[PDB]
Amino acid sequence: PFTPFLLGENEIRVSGNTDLRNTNRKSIKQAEWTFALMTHFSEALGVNCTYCHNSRAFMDWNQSTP
Amino acid sequence: PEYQNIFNKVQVREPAYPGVELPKGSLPRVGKPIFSYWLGKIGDAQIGPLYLGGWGIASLISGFIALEVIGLNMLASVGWDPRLFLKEFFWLGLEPPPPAYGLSIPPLAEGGWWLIAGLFLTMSLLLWWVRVYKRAKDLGMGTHLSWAFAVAILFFLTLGFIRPVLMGSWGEAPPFGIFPHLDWTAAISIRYGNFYYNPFHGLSIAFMYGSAVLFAMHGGTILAVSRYGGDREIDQITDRGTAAERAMLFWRWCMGFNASMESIHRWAWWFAVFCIINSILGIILTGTVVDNWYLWAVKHGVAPSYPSELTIDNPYLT
Amino acid sequence: PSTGLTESEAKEFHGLFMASMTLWFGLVVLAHILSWMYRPWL
Amino acid sequence: EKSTTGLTEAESKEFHGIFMASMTLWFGLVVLAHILSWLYRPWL
Amino acid sequence: KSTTGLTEAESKEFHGIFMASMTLWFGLVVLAHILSWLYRPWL
Amino acid sequence: KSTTGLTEAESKEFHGIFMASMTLWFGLVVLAHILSWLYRPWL
Amino acid sequence: EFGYITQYFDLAQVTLWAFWLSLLSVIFFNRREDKREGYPQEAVQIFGKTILTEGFPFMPAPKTFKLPHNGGDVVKPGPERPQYDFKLEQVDRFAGAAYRPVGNPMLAGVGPGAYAVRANKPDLTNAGDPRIVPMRVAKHFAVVDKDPDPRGMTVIGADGQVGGKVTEIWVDRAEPQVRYLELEAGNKKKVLVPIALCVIKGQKREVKVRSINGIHFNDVPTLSNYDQITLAEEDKVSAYYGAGTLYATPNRAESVL
Amino acid sequence: ALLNFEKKYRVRGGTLVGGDLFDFWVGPFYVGFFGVSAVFFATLGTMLILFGAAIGPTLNIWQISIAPPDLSVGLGFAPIREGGLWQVITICAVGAFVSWALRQVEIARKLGMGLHVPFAFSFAILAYLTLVFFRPVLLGAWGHAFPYGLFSHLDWVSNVGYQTLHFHYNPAHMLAISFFFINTLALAMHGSLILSVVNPQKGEEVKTAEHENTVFRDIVGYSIGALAIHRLGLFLAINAAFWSAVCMILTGPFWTRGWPEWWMWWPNLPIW
Amino acid sequence: MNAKSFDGMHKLWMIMNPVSTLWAIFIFQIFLGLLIHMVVLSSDLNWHDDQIPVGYQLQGETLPVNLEMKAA
Amino acid sequence: AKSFDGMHKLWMIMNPVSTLWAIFIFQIFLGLLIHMVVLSSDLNWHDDQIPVGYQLQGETLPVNLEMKAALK
Amino acid sequence: AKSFDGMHKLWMIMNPVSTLWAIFIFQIFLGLLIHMVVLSSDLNWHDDQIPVGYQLQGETLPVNLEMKAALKD
Amino acid sequence: DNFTGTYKMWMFIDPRRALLFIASFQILLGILIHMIVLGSDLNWHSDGIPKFYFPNAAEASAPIDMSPIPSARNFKFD
Ligand code: BCL
Ligand code: BCL
Ligand code: BCL
Ligand code: BCL
Ligand code: BCL
Ligand SMILES: CC(C)=CCC/C(C)=C\CC/C(C)=C/CC/C(C)=C\CC/C(C)=C/CC/C(C)=C/CC/C(C)=C/CC/C(C)=C/CC1=C(C)C(=O)c2ccccc2C1=O
Ligand SMILES: COC(C)(C)CCC/C(C)=C/C=C/C(C)=C/C=C/C(C)=C/C=C\C=C(C)\C=C\C=C(C)\C=C\C=C(/C)CCCC(C)(C)OC
Ligand SMILES: [Ca+2]
Ligand SMILES: [Ca+2]
Ligand SMILES: [Ca+2]
Ligand SMILES: [Ca+2]
Ligand SMILES: [Fe+3]
């Protein structure tokens, strides 16, 4: 996941901003590439997902940590 | 203590039973029946014979072509080495086409083998459906086992064919692996905002828990009255004995209502089928109607709201 | 007679089966001629 | 003792005659299809 | 004793035809490989 | 006592043909390996 | 804007309502099928009068089982055969009080020793033969060696005393397996014991029957003909052994702690 | 109300505690000492859940939540408004569940039958106690247990799962899921088969045991038997519960990395 | 021997079932045929995609009609 | 040297038919396995591009080259 | 020197056919296992490129080199 | 000849089962070879001969796996 994300400049976000079907066209494969990069963030610092997220909404900034 | 009836202490043999006579015009049964002492410690010891007619051969040709394809692609992914195949076996898989190809037929090493294996597995399961139906109907029985099988086939086709077509991409379907298909499960939950806030997912979990509860309860109750001949359910249904009476008093006294020896089997049927019906309904709406299950749950007054105390600044707004 | 049909019954069935199959294939050919006229694929 | 299908030798001869005729006709049609395909889109 | 019910005459008959068929099959295989070597040699 | 129903004459017969067949098979294996060594030596 | 809303009503909502209504309706049908046995129930009134009530939802209309080999029709819910003659005394003067047996508790047919009133015909195979039979009538069965043959062993009876000796095994021809052991008792009668109430020790060559006592094997119910057993007789035998779980010793029905 | 056949079975005796004082029925229910206990504890627990909802922000059914203490309380005693209510309710819950099991034992003794059902219930109880008692004690704090709320214990489940980066690769989790899935399949087949044999094709007789064996030997080649399928059922459900308890006692106390990294013992065997 | 060593070989079918053997041979041959064709198609010897004697997708992309339509 | 005299008596305790079937099946499995193990090593003979690379041969045919020029 | 006299009586309590089958199957499994264990180490003899590397030999044939050259244009 | 008595084959092999095997196998093999040839360069449905009939994308890249779901239909990727 480093070639598209840490040298190239691709969008990491995959989730929508409303609840029903809208203009979002990302796929499950893009979600997998994001999941891979996040796994590396966790390993490189010695932490879990919950060091920066609340898993019940991985996309909300008002429910993240500082 | 007292005998618990979990293993057979004394075994007995007679010559093998060939089976109830079939209607005239049928093929013979293939195989000579053998006996297993270890299988007889816990159940019936006879293995075979088997019935192979028209539909169960077409099935088994389809299924084995599919298996050969899946196995060979997993093996090509390590460079044909069987040592590496055994070493890294849970990480291998056959992957779907890249999502940019849409619903077209892609080249063979970039998703076409996935498409072939999917088609052959589908045909295999539909031919098996016809076999199950005809086998039960030729012996003169009700066809209840075909209805439940139909539900299961429908769930296999929903995730895999119907949802990918309604979305516009074959790359939305699971791959054929062990760890690869677990990764698919997690990713589809992450992309469509948290399956815990999908209500059909909650209802199917309710019915899977309930299946385990109900079958522990039934298995216990019939082993507990097998000293009064309770394991013979057909006779207890058509001539109620003391085993059925005790079995229904137990539950009536314990929780206030009961079923009968025939009705509990309808409860079993339905608890196993509602699980999968809700599975279909929950997958078919994801992506095609709802894009974020958590935001849906918030709009309909379902999600709790933890206290905040802080303010985090969205850096895309700055 | 593993199906219980005699030889006369088999002859009868065969007659009508072959007629029906020929008619079906005729209709298939007609459909393909129309499709070739509308959108030739080779 | 031995595995049998109940066919006599005359019935087997009859079945064999028609089986071989049918297989030959099928293979003839296959050859024709491949000649047409080679004329249209040669693959080797 | 494990037995197939075939006598010795029946076994001789079966063996004759089995060997003939296997020889014909292997002949066809050899022919296919000669053609393939002429078209696309692999070694 | 575990027994196969074969007498000693039947066992002698079976053994004769078994040993002949195994020897022929191993001969063919040796020939295949000599060809492979000539084409692509591995040690 | 992260949580903007366009429209409140959607399809997921309607579909969820439809499911709530499709459940809530199989409950109805299953609860109605639950009441083809044991109903109408008997409600006791303010001063002892008993009426028949039927519950919620009401009982279904009767259906018919057609039994094989001209074994008759069974309508359900339908009539009932008459109870036998149990005697009981209530302990406390209210409808929800318990009962005590009046005579000898072992020979009373109340409590865990109650039984049902079934047909006086044997259960049949698919060919029309009786299903449960002794191993001398079924001449093709054999006990698998590797397993202790119980024929010959003794029948110790839960207080250490001897009950009798095993003389026959009763098998099940439809599903090959052991169902009963036949034994000769202390007064030289032939009585049966279900195989699911026997612990068989091969080396001691004993069968331990924890249910009843040694002297209790003399009063086990007997059969009419010893080449077959009927549904009624199965019930009687099994129920007699089940009465001992509470009546064998006077201390068995008496609050562990 | 009593069933048609019920009166001859309502005798006294069979109890564990108490004696003749609580040996009666109320309607269809049987009460006993443990019946009184169970209803007492259920009522108290329910009322405390409701009060903990009253002091919260909402009485919406989906958004009620009562949470355990903080991790700084350790294995001590928390204030009522910040964790102690959760502790009292979790005492009531244990009391009610064990009472339920012992009442079952009394009933089965009275009717003359075996103790298989309370024994299978014991494994559900064991899984609950693993989540609220054993795992918290081994990790050193009550605040490792889940809060009481629909939708709010699901947030717990989610975050605990992601504390190991990918919880699908937990081995005992895989084994338990295997048992759950196979149990639903078996229950569908058993239900279908009995219904099919007593509800045959229109205008036919009820079928027999031979038909039951034949159908599955025709389709699949092996039939397990009418008494062994009940055994197989008790077995699959109990094993599901057991391996769930193991998988949770492994996570945290005995493994703190990601779960994919455990599996690394396999491709590192020096034999390939 | 060396010449009379394989004399009684025809007796083989008194201990080996002919029907089972026939079915096994046929099924094994079909499975092996599929396997070898798939293994050779996944190598450098592939004969469907090698663009010999001509590439057909490339041939279709450069037809004058398609070129003139793509030009607009 | 007379230590292996009674060896022929082996077939009075070991079943000949079972042994034959076991040997045949094991030999086929081992054949497939060794071919796959050697093909996945440096000795691979299908993909080694000897005596020539065929995909590369198809990419540089004059017809394909002239078509790829007119596209680009 | 006289401790192992009655050893031949072993076959009066242990079944010879079962023992033979067990030995044969165990030996085949162990043969496969040791070959796989040695192939996965530094002693591997199929991939060590001795006495020559054949993939490398194929990549640098003059015909393949000349075809790869005419593609860079 | 050597093949004089081949017709006796059907005295121990069931001709009904033989027919049921052969029909099934041939139909399945037909489907298989068609799908294999369609997933290659010999494909004849979307090859643009004698004409491309669909409104295809004007610039379609070579699709990779890290891709989004397409907005419109397209069948010309090469
Ligand atoms: C570009 C491609 C063309 C196209 C090219 C072709 C070609 C080529 C063929 C068809 C054929 C069919 N097409 Mg078309 N077809 C197109 C678009 C459509 C659309 C649509 C929504 O766009 C539909 C609904 C159809 C539907 C049909 C069916 C009528 C027919 C397949 C019948 C079948 O499967 O029998 C299977 C069922 C049986 C065999 C059962 C046995 C007989 C039964 C009892 C009688 C059924 C009658 C039958 C349907 C015909 C009735 C017509 C009457 C004689 C008047 N096509 C497009 C426009 N289509 C096939 C056909 O017409 O067959 C003659 C055919 O060869
Ligand atoms: C570029 C490649 C070519 C192509 C190259 C070939 C080649 C090469 C062959 C085919 C063959 C077939 N092709 Mg084509 N084919 C093309 C495009 C198509 C398309 C399409 C949508 O584009 C279709 C639907 C078909 C369909 C067909 C079938 C008619 C036939 C397969 C028969 C079978 O499956 O065995 C079914 C077999 C059985 C059930 C057993 C034996 C049959 C017996 C006698 C009873 C069945 C009834 C009847 C005879 C069935 C066939 C109908 C005809 C009369 C043959 N092709 C393209 C243009 N095709 C095969 C063929 O022609 O067979 C003669 C064949 O060899
Ligand atoms: C680069 C590689 C070459 C190639 C190299 C080879 C080589 C080498 C061989 C084949 C063989 C076969 N190839 Mg090729 N093959 C290629 C491409 C193809 C393609 C294709 C779509 O591209 C197809 C469909 C085939 C199909 C076939 C089958 C006919 C045959 C496997 C038969 C079998 O498995 O019998 C299994 C079934 C049985 C044993 C049962 C009995 C046989 C039945 C009764 C008849 C089957 C067909 C028969 C042999 C031919 C018809 C009869 C004769 C005309 C008299 N090849 C390419 C071009 N192929 C093999 C072969 O032909 O041997 C004869 C073989 O050795
Ligand atoms: C670099 C490696 C070399 C190579 C080196 C070797 C070596 C070394 C050997 C083989 C052997 C074989 N190779 Mg090679 N081989 C290569 C590439 C191939 C390719 C291919 C698609 O590329 C194929 C299909 C084969 C296929 C074969 C089989 C003919 C044979 C395996 C027999 C077997 O398993 O029987 C096991 C099954 C049984 C014994 C069942 C019993 C059935 C009876 C006895 C009849 C079976 C017939 C039998 C298969 C062949 C006899 C041939 C006849 C005399 C014509 N090789 C490459 C070029 N190959 C082996 C062999 O030659 O055996 C003598 C062998 O030792
Ligand atoms: C991101 C989150 C992770 C995840 C994180 C976890 C965590 C964390 C846990 C599990 C646990 C489980 N997971 Mg998981 N799990 C995930 C994905 C899955 C998937 C899937 C398809 O993806 C499946 C099928 C499962 C399945 C399972 C089960 C193996 C297990 C739950 C059963 C159980 O605990 O029974 C045990 C039964 C009980 C605890 C019930 C207690 C019963 C009590 C005694 C009786 C109550 C009566 C009541 C009060 C009375 C009401 C009365 C009214 C009158 C009616 N998980 C994802 C990857 N999973 C749980 C587990 O294993 O715990 C042991 C667990 O803690
Ligand atoms: C709470 C309160 C306000 C109390 C006041 C009332 C007072 C004062 C006292 C009452 C006395 C007492 C002690 C009451 C305790 C009871 C109370 C209050 C609550 C408990 C009720 C309760 C726990 C019910 C839960 C019911 C549920 C959801 C069950 C789940 C499983 C389920 C859906 C089962 C349906 C299928 C059934 C009926 C299975 C049972 C069943 C099985 C499993 C067989 O195998 C079998 C085999 C052969 C014949 C019959 C049967 C059979 O009936
Ligand atoms: C080395 O091995 C050999 C070759 C010797 C054989 C051994 C085989 C082995 C070891 C196999 C191992 C297999 C494993 C581990 C498989 C794992 C499988 C799992 C867990 C799969 C899970 C999910 C997959 C799903 C749900 C797939 C669903 C696919 C569907 C529904 C496909 C639909 C496609 C269709 C209907 C075709 C449409 C095509 C067309 C032509 C219409 O498009 C236009
Ligand atoms: Ca080519
Ligand atoms: Ca080469
Ligand atoms: Ca080397
Ligand atoms: Ca075209
Ligand atoms: Fe049941």
Ligand SMILES: [Mg+2]
């Ligand atoms: Mg993946």
